[PDB]
Write a protein that binds this ligand. Structure first.
Ligand SMILES: O=P(O)(O)OC[C@H]1O[C@H](OP(=O)(O)OP(=O)(O)O)[C@H](O)[C@@H]1O
Ligand SMILES: [Mg+2]
Length: 424
């Protein structure tokens, strides 16, 4: 399987620290929900690990016990790594404690995830290149998403996204620097199809799924397939309209920020600029006119001054340093690759290594891999002739659909997720 152990810190996860005043009803409910989570993990053969610095005394309605005895009594069959009890264990903050746990359990790094809340635990997981699961049931977080508001949500995430062999519905490579992934195949070639709700009165603004569903799908599939390893940036593509280019990003920004935090990366919402309104590729296709990649190349470029501080709005003063950096590029659906190949062309010209990820792969359409014959100056507007494109190869649809993947399988995954409850 993919997930073999879950590391839990204690502060504001198993026992509150920040607040004196957590209601007893909350502690009892969290204790009971953690019991369910650990039993669920045990039933799946997933180990439960506690990682702590101090063997502090804990006051019980029965008396005072050490933290080790407390955890052993309430959550038996967990494995407690406590620096005070084992001088072997290196520091948490630097990520070294994760290396130690990996060796002790004979597990690979991305065979574990890390549930925490304290800043030291976020640092421990990210510096240890382990997926961070931000537990916010004792202390809330407002700055970004990809959160987990109660223990049940961790079980939901694991059960829905982390236990099946196929993390991607479609995936393929070309040459050595071209890597394409999509979560699920889907029919996008119908005049009716749109990824965004038709009515602004709906609280759901995506037509398929929801932000919670998609960020958790993305996070699981990217992490357990190894794509997050060494990734510095995550970014989304831009819509065709120069007046409204950030529709997907505006819906998903909150969650993409949190996924970036969990990978020790940065979400660059406006790394791409749509400087001139482009032909809408989907609409050209339904009009049965051919889509040419220069319609994208000639209307987008890399933003030399993206937002560096999504809280403050402060922009980079010099273009972000992308040379030698790994960037995850997200778009909603991929048909023939015009959008992703343009994203890749610009980022590759800036020296980056690129991973092209989509929620959906259009059924029965192959991706054409392109390289420019005119040198791209990626931080400014470029204008290429159709003859400036070298079509070097193909990532086909049919041969790269993964076993068992299908649009109906996505629909049932969404149903499974939306209605999820403790498996009875
Ligand atoms: O793989 P491709 O052949 O590039 O096709 C997929 C692209 O087409 C759609 O955008 P579109 O250009 O229709 O504009 P929109 O997002 O503004 O609706 C979709 O959102 C992708 O960006
Ligand atoms: Mg688009």
């Amino acid at each position: 399987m993919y997930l073999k152990a879950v590391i839990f810190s204690i502060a504001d996860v198993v026992l509150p620290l920040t607040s004196n005043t957590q209601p007893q009803e909350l502690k009892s409910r969290i204790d009971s929900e953690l019991r369910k989570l650990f039993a669920f993990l045990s039933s799946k053969g997933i180990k439960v690990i506690f990682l702590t610095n101090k063997n502090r005394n804990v006051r019980t309605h029965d008396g005072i016990v050490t933290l080790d005895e407390y955890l052993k009594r309430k959550f038996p069959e967990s494995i407690h790594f406590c620096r005070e009890l084992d001088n072997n264990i290196p520091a948490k903050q630097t990520g070294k404690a994760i290396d130690f746990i990996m060796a002790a359990l004979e597990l690979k790094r991305n065979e574990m995830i890390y549930v925490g809340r304290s800043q030291e635990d976020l640092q421990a997981a990210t510096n240890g290149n382990t997926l961070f699961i931000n537990a916010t049931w004792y202390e809330p977080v407002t700055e970004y998403g990809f959160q987990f508001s109660e223990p049940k949500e961790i079980a939901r995430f694991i059960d829905v996204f982390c236990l099946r062999e196929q993390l991607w519905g479609w995936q393929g490579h070309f040459n050595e620097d071209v890597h394409y992934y999509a979560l699920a195949p889907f029919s996008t070639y119908v005049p009716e199809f749109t990824m965004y709700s038709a009515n602004a009165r709906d609280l759901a603004k995506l037509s398929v799924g929801s932000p919670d569903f998609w960020i958790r799908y993305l996070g699981a599939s990217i992490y357990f397939s190894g794509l997050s390893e060494g990734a510095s940036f995550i970014t989304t593509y831009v819509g065709h309209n120069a007046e409204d280019p950030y529709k997907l990003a505006n819906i998903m920004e909150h969650d993409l920020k949190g996924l970036a935090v969990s990978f020790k990366g940065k979400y660059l919402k406006d790394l791409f600029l749509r400087h001139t309104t482009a032909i809408k590729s989907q609409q050209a296709r339904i009009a049965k006119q051919e889509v040419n990649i220069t319609s994208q190349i000639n209307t987008v470029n890399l933003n030399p001054a993206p937002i560096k501080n999504l809280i403050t709005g402060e922009r980079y003063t010099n273009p972000p340093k992308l040379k030698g950096k790994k960037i995850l590029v997200i778009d909603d659906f991929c048909t023939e690759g015009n959008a992703h190949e343009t994203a890749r062309m610009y980022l590759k010209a800036a020296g980056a290594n690129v991973i092209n990820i989509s929620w959906l792969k259009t059924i029965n359409r192959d991706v054409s891999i392109c390289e420019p014959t005119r040198k791209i100056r990626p931080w400014e507007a470029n204008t290429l002739d159709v003859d400036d494109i070298n079509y070097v190869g193909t990532i086909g649809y049919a041969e790269n659909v993964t076993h068992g993947s299908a649009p109906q399988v996505l629909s049932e995954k969404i149903q499974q997720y939306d209605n999820w409850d403790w498996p009875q």
